[PDB]
Amino acid sequence: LSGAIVALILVIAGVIIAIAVVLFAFGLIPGISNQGSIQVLGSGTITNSTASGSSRTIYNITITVKNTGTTSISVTSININGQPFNINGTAPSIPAGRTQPITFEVTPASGKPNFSPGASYTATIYFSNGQGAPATLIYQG
Amino acid sequence: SISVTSININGQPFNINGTAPSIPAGRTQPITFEVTPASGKPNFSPGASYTATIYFSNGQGAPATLIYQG
Amino acid sequence: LSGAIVALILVIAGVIIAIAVVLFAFGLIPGISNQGSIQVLGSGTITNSTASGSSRTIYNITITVKNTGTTSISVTSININGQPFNINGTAPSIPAGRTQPITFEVTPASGKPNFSPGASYTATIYFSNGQGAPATLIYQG
Amino acid sequence: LSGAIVALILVIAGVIIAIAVVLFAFGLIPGISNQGSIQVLGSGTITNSTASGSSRTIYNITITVKNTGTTSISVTSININGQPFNINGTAPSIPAGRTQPITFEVTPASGKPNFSPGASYTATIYFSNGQGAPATLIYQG
Amino acid sequence: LSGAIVALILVIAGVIIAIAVVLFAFGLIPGISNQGSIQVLGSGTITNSTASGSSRTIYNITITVKNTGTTSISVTSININGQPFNINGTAPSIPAGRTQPITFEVTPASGKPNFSPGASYTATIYFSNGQGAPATLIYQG
Amino acid sequence: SISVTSININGQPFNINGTAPSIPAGRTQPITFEVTPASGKPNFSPGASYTATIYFSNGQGAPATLIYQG
Amino acid sequence: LSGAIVALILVIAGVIIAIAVVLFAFGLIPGISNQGSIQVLGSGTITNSTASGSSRTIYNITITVKNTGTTSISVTSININGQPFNINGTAPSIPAGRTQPITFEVTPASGKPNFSPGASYTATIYFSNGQGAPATLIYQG
Ligand SMILES: *[C@@H]1O[C@H](CO)[C@@H](O[C@@H]2O[C@H](CO[C@H]3O[C@H](CO)[C@@H](O)[C@H](O)[C@@H]3O)[C@@H](O[C@H]3O[C@H](CO)[C@@H](O)[C@H](O)[C@@H]3O)[C@H](O[C@@H]3O[C@H](CS(=O)(=O)O)[C@@H](O)[C@H](O)[C@H]3O)[C@H]2NC(C)=O)[C@H](O)[C@H]1NC(C)=O
Ligand SMILES: *[C@@H]1O[C@H](CO)[C@@H](O[C@@H]2O[C@H](CO[C@H]3O[C@H](CO)[C@@H](O)[C@H](O)[C@@H]3O)[C@@H](O[C@H]3O[C@H](CO)[C@@H](O)[C@H](O)[C@@H]3O)[C@H](O[C@@H]3O[C@H](CS(=O)(=O)O)[C@@H](O)[C@H](O)[C@H]3O)[C@H]2NC(C)=O)[C@H](O)[C@H]1NC(C)=O
Ligand SMILES: *[C@@H]1O[C@H](CO)[C@@H](O[C@@H]2O[C@H](CO[C@H]3O[C@H](CO)[C@@H](O)[C@H](O)[C@@H]3O)[C@@H](O[C@H]3O[C@H](CO)[C@@H](O)[C@H](O)[C@@H]3O)[C@H](O[C@@H]3O[C@H](CS(=O)(=O)O)[C@@H](O)[C@H](O)[C@H]3O)[C@H]2NC(C)=O)[C@H](O)[C@H]1NC(C)=O
Ligand SMILES: *[C@@H]1O[C@H](CO)[C@@H](O[C@@H]2O[C@H](CO[C@H]3O[C@H](CO)[C@@H](O)[C@H](O)[C@@H]3O)[C@@H](O[C@H]3O[C@H](CO)[C@@H](O)[C@H](O)[C@@H]3O)[C@H](O[C@@H]3O[C@H](CS(=O)(=O)O)[C@@H](O)[C@H](O)[C@H]3O)[C@H]2NC(C)=O)[C@H](O)[C@H]1NC(C)=O
Ligand SMILES: *[C@@H]1O[C@H](CO)[C@@H](O[C@@H]2O[C@H](CO[C@H]3O[C@H](CO)[C@@H](O)[C@H](O)[C@@H]3O)[C@@H](O[C@H]3O[C@H](CO)[C@@H](O)[C@H](O)[C@@H]3O)[C@H](O[C@@H]3O[C@H](CS(=O)(=O)O)[C@@H](O)[C@H](O)[C@H]3O)[C@H]2NC(C)=O)[C@H](O)[C@H]1NC(C)=O
Ligand SMILES: *[C@@H]1O[C@H](CO)[C@@H](O[C@@H]2O[C@H](CO[C@H]3O[C@H](CO)[C@@H](O)[C@H](O)[C@@H]3O)[C@@H](O[C@H]3O[C@H](CO)[C@@H](O)[C@H](O)[C@@H]3O)[C@H](O[C@@H]3O[C@H](CS(=O)(=O)O)[C@@H](O)[C@H](O)[C@H]3O)[C@H]2NC(C)=O)[C@H](O)[C@H]1NC(C)=O
Ligand SMILES: *[C@@H]1O[C@H](CO)[C@@H](O[C@@H]2O[C@H](CO[C@H]3O[C@H](CO)[C@@H](O)[C@H](O)[C@@H]3O)[C@@H](O[C@H]3O[C@H](CO)[C@@H](O)[C@H](O)[C@@H]3O)[C@H](O[C@@H]3O[C@H](CS(=O)(=O)O)[C@@H](O)[C@H](O)[C@H]3O)[C@H]2NC(C)=O)[C@H](O)[C@H]1NC(C)=O
Ligand SMILES: *[C@@H]1O[C@H](CO)[C@@H](O[C@@H]2O[C@H](CO[C@H]3O[C@H](CO)[C@@H](O)[C@H](O)[C@@H]3O)[C@@H](O)[C@H](O)[C@H]2NC(C)=O)[C@H](O)[C@H]1NC(C)=O
Ligand SMILES: *[C@@H]1O[C@H](CO)[C@@H](O[C@@H]2O[C@H](CO[C@H]3O[C@H](CO)[C@@H](O)[C@H](O)[C@@H]3O)[C@@H](O)[C@H](O)[C@H]2NC(C)=O)[C@H](O)[C@H]1NC(C)=O
Ligand SMILES: *[C@@H]1O[C@H](CO)[C@@H](O[C@@H]2O[C@H](CO[C@H]3O[C@H](CO)[C@@H](O)[C@H](O)[C@@H]3O)[C@@H](O)[C@H](O)[C@H]2NC(C)=O)[C@H](O)[C@H]1NC(C)=O
Ligand SMILES: *[C@@H]1O[C@H](CO)[C@@H](O[C@@H]2O[C@H](CO[C@H]3O[C@H](CO)[C@@H](O)[C@H](O)[C@@H]3O)[C@@H](O)[C@H](O)[C@H]2NC(C)=O)[C@H](O)[C@H]1NC(C)=O
């Protein structure tokens, strides 16, 4: 008798644990699937903010940005002409569903830039999502 | 009627501060309860997913995904 | 009489041992299921730390890292351009739920690197989880 | 009794094998990087190399090859104008960090090639890291 | 009395068979590696090979094949342009560590192929290690 | 504490010449050991990656990827 | 005595059920291929279909459709250039194995479109498989 009752328990338990894992897999879908992103529109600009012979050079990155997602997002880094820059001061944030010009200040992480007036540099902006967007910036002066 | 005995979040043990919530026979419903870390200090990040396992008075444990909203 | 009493004991014992194993299987789920990981954001950089004609070359790997899990984690190895490197000095550690730039020093395990200024190398960072993440590092100089 | 004891063994073994496969998937990643170690720079040259009255047609091929990996790599095959060619003698190799004009001898496998002085032929070179690369070869005579 | 004595035998046998199956699962793993031993390099060539007035249409096929396994491997079948082909005579083989132009004779199984001079045909070659590989073949006439 | 007992690389068996190394409980380590082919010869290539399987004293084995350095 | 007989029956039944599950898995493979039964080919046209200043704008969607499936399959819905539309008339249906032109009347679900002569618009047509096919319609009206 014993063998068949044990076999039946492990069938019923097998069904329970298997269905629990299938329901778990359906529960992941809202977290992993998430349409919409920050989009970068047109060219941006770089402007020299540095003043008074200060020890650190500071630049100004103005660009037009459209958040197509359902949540507020922020910038976290920029890379320009292959060189990393830190975003000095509070990083700006783009509300859900909104198009804005945004401006923020940056400093080189190491070395110095060699920008030229009217030249165009490729840049990559990284958002709080981990998602990044390639952009073109024109150096104004 | 069956009640929540314990919860573990992302491997970490947690204590249900408030009284155990209970689900009546045959019902489907939302269930809400207050919980506190058993040790240390967690740091949930907005919009990230964590796996709870909730243990009910059957001894049955169910894995579930929670998204942090705070 | 004997046969039926023994048959009944082995039914009841069968139920007990089978339910004990089902409860054990539900007890594994918190250990094996563990969402969230270390995520590597944007490009990192390599910088030459070597000095004074020393016998060992030392490099600097700076990268931005986001721990989405509920526990503190550390780096344990890096492989760059197919070559293994040791993390000289205490390996850095990323607290739960936190985004950080991290920096650590490394030395080749065998041979020598042949990095070139401004070139980009694929790398893999391995964390204490056993989980690893592919990354791109730009050699600065 | 037997059924539950077997279920417990297969549960624990299942966890061990599943974790091993996940770790293996992360362990592959470094090996993918090496597939791009080589590139071919500019046009190369074909030259008829065989001695007077000799049975074998043999050609000298010269190309500039750049190696960016951490190990020496060698030529393994060439396809010229669609024809597969055999490589004669020892294969050449490119040291790990270097860019060099490389020269080697080849002989046709599929039949008789009819190169014309000053004509330009496409080729694909194949290397010991499993990479293939497009090339242009000018037949000098 | 009988019932308990039988239960003891089936408990011990259960442990022995369960452990044997777990060890078998680990014992499979080496055999999986060999499935990727071969790759086909560049275009190959088809050539009409049959003698004047002969009943059989027969073609010569030439391709470069690289073997990276620890054993010799042979060609077992080819499918050209969707048609299955039969292989005539002895199959060719590629020595364990080598890259070679390989030549073999084939004859159509499914009907009459109508190759056109200079046209390019996709093929799948199949090898004695159970692997299949995509190939391109240019019909020379 | 556990030890290695065999390795298979690219489908070929190898013997672990000299004392097999051993890993203490709860510990992470780089380990190094020497091996010889049991039959035939390998045909490794610099920078190429080979699948391998390491077998421990448990009978448990683990798949691995090895890069041939030179 | 009984325990051994029960063990034997469950061993034999185990073999049968395991084989049945393996055969069932292959039985799904033909069924899932029905998801690809329809192809939309060539380019379609869209033309004014309303008259006499009637209250509804109505149009004509002519397309060529090939059905590779074993059953007659029908148009469930259409979306034109991102906009939802309703098929006024009864759903058209494509018989098994046929290639044919298909023509049907359609109306905007909301607002007012303004197709311009000779411009191209992308329809996606959804068939009773749940399969959706993108197609280009040129406006003729
Ligand atoms: C953005 O604005 C920044 C601040 O004005 C500029 O950085 C400053 O550049 C000065 C020289 O300018 C020229 O040369 C650069 C290459 O070195 C080039 O990128 C520029 O486009 C421009 O052609 C520099 O002056 C230093 O160097 C001069 C020689 O080049 C020398 O004459 C100066 O005496 C001085 O050493 C600034 O450096 C700082 O100068 C301070 C004195 S003063 O120059 O203000 O009178 C001194 O006290 C301080 O120690 C020294 O560091 C330099 N400023 C900084 C912070 O580095 C930058 O060029 C502008 N453009 C871009 C694209 O970044
Ligand atoms: C990172 O920094 C490291 C330390 O400065 C660099 O390693 C050092 O490289 C020196 C040569 O530099 C050039 O050649 C390299 C290839 O060999 C190349 O990777 C570099 O990009 C660069 O073009 C080397 O100097 C040795 O070799 C010279 C010939 O190449 C020769 O002129 C020197 O006399 C010397 O032999 C360094 O080696 C060490 O040199 C000591 C004397 S001194 O050079 O400091 O004056 C000597 O006492 C010592 O025994 C010898 O080993 C070499 N240092 C080390 C520790 O290996 C490295 O190139 C930099 N870049 C990268 C990408 O790693
Ligand atoms: C590479 O160089 C080799 C010599 O180093 C060449 O071999 C020589 O080929 C000559 C003809 O080449 C033509 O025909 C080939 C097939 O035979 C063909 O593959 C080539 O692409 C090309 O179209 C050959 O000349 C013989 O044949 C001629 C007719 O084809 C005839 O006019 C000649 O008189 C001669 O019989 C060479 O043979 C040698 O010729 C010597 C005299 S001379 O031709 O140098 O004036 C003669 O003394 C000698 O006995 C005879 O064998 C043959 N060998 C040599 C040493 O020249 C090979 O074709 C080259 N391949 C390419 C692709 O350029
Ligand atoms: C095809 O490739 C072959 C190698 O794969 C080449 O063989 C090499 O030929 C070099 C001289 O070739 C010159 O003269 C030919 C007439 O004899 C002419 O057809 C060629 O076009 C070319 O103008 C030879 O170099 C010798 O002369 C050099 C001075 O010019 C001197 O520096 C060298 O030391 C040598 O004496 C090559 O030399 C051999 O060199 C070996 C070292 S290495 O050159 O490979 O680095 C050395 O170990 C050996 O002892 C020596 O004999 C010679 N190389 C080989 C491997 O044989 C052939 O010329 C190429 N053909 C064409 C038409 O270009
Ligand atoms: C591979 O090579 C074989 C010869 O080595 C070819 O066999 C020859 O095929 C000729 C026609 O080929 C065409 O028709 C085939 C079906 O018959 C078809 O499979 C081919 O793809 C191609 O479309 C055939 O020519 C005969 O038929 C012609 C009409 O189709 C007619 O115009 C000819 O006069 C002739 O009757 C060959 O037969 C031989 O022709 C000799 C004269 S000549 O044609 O060489 O000028 C004649 O003397 C002889 O009696 C007669 O049998 C036939 N055999 C030979 C030796 O040429 C085969 O088709 C090739 N396959 C491919 C794919 O290219
Ligand atoms: C299709 O494949 C067949 C093999 O599967 C080929 O048969 C081989 O033909 C070689 C010569 O072919 C040349 O001449 C043909 C006209 O007769 C022409 O149609 C071809 O396009 C090609 O130009 C033959 O090689 C001989 O000649 C060589 C010099 O060119 C010499 O080096 C060889 O030793 C040989 O004398 C092949 O030779 C046979 O070779 C055997 C060794 S191996 O070559 O297989 O390594 C040897 O054991 C045997 O005794 C000898 O007779 C010959 N191979 C076979 C197996 O028959 C056929 O040409 C291919 N057809 C085409 C159109 O390419
Ligand atoms: C497809 O054909 C349809 C019917 O022929 C067109 O829809 C009808 O368009 C009439 C005017 O057409 C002009 O304006 C359109 C935008 O409204 C434009 O797309 C056309 O290209 C063209 O430039 C419209 O008539 C109304 O508006 C006129 C002014 O534009 C005015 O003169 C009329 O008196 C009328 O107010 C139709 O609306 C219908 O008109 C009926 C009277 S009559 O026009 O037949 O004399 C009226 O009884 C009815 O209530 C009113 O709805 C309009 N029909 C509909 C259903 O909207 C359509 O533009 C064509 N093209 C496309 C791309 O859809
Ligand atoms: C980077 O961000 C800092 C805040 O995160 C910001 O600090 C603020 O500074 C302003 C005034 O700064 C001026 O003076 C300093 C010298 O003290 C210069 O380096 C600077 O360029 C400006 O000219 C101050 O009003 C405010 O209270 C500060 N805020 C905080 C939170 O401390 C830095 O100024 C900024 N760096 C640059 C170069 O702008
Ligand atoms: C943790 O669990 C307790 C029981 O499960 C619960 O006690 C109940 O408390 C409410 C009123 O609590 C208020 O006042 C206390 C101070 O006494 C605060 O700490 C608390 O935040 C509230 O502001 C009471 O009406 C009820 O009868 C209690 N229930 C029982 C069974 O005793 C605690 O409230 C709960 N902790 C929190 C923060 O809610
Ligand atoms: C690798 O990590 C070591 C610690 O794990 C570290 O030791 C520390 O060294 C610093 C000073 O090191 C300098 O001098 C040595 C020669 O003695 C050079 O090799 C080195 O590059 C530095 O220039 C010392 O202050 C500190 O107390 C040491 N800490 C410990 C725990 O011993 C090594 O320096 C480091 N290697 C490199 C190359 O940085
Ligand atoms: C395989 O393992 C052996 C021990 O299990 C080891 O023996 C030791 O050998 C070393 C010195 O070996 C050198 O010389 C021999 C020739 O005699 C070479 O084959 C070898 O490659 C080395 O170059 C010796 O100091 C030590 O005492 C030996 N230990 C014992 C216990 O005998 C073998 O050397 C080793 N095989 C290889 C190839 O390393």
Author numbering:
A (entry chain L), C (entry chain I), D (entry chain J), E (entry chain G), G (entry chain K): 16 to 156
B (entry chain E), F (entry chain F): 87 to 156
Authors' own words:
While some archaea produce only one type of filament, the archaeal model species Sulfolobus acidocaldarius generates four. These include rotary swimming propellers analogous to bacterial flagella (archaella), pili for twitching motility (Aap), adhesive fibres (threads), and filaments facilitating homologous recombination upon UV stress (UV pili). Here, we use cryo-electron microscopy to describe the structure of the S. acidocaldarius archaellum at 2.0 Å resolution, and update the structures of the thread and the Aap pilus at 2.7 Å and 2.6 Å resolution, respectively.
Our new cryoEM maps of the archaellum, Aap and thread enabled us to build their complex N-glycans with greater precision. This was particularly the case for the Aap, where N-glycans were previously only partially resolved. Measuring 110 Å, the archaellum is considerably wider than the Aap (80 Å), which is mostly due to the larger head domain of the archaellin. Interestingly, the S. acidocaldarius Aap show an unusual 3-conformer architecture, where each 3-start strand has a distinct conformation. Considering that Aap drive twitching motility in S. acidocaldarius (and likely also in other Sulfolobales species), it is conceivable that the 3-conformer structures are linked to this function, for example enabling rapid retraction. On the other hand, Aap do not exhibit the screw-like profile that is caused by the glycosylation domain in the archaellum. In contrast, the diameters of the Aap and archaellum exceed that of either pore, meaning that a local reorganisation of the S-layer would have to take place to accommodate these filaments. With a diameter of 80 Å, Aap would either require a similar local disassembly of SlaA subunits, or at least a significant conformational change of the six SlaA N-termini delineating a hexagonal pore. The Aap’s 3-conformer organisation possibly represents a metastable state that could facilitate the retraction of the filament.
